Amino acid sequence: YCQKFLWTCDSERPCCEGLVCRLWCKIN
């Protein structure tokens, strides 16, 4: 799955649509 908001993402792990992969997955 994509990483949920508080689910810290890595640049190897995609963020959900509308979310940016910062330190953690941030919503726009």
Q: Domain boundaries in the chain?
A: 1-28
∠ CA(2), CA(13), CA(3), 5° rounding? 30
Contacts of 9 (CB under 8 A, 6+ apart): 3, 15, 21, 22, 24, 25
- Could you tell me whether strands 19-21 and 25-27 are parallel, antiparallel, or unpaired per DSSP bridges? antiparallel
∠ CA(12), CA(17), CA(7), 5° rounding? 55
- Rounded to 10 degrees, the C-alpha dihedral 9/14/20/21 comes to 30
Maximum Cα–Cα distance across the chain: 20
d(CA 3, CA 25): 7
d(CA 14, CA 8): 10
Please answer whether residues 11 and 23 qualify as being in contact, where contact means their C-beta atoms are separated by less than 8 angstroms: no
18: left (phi over 0), alpha (psi -120 to 50) or beta: left
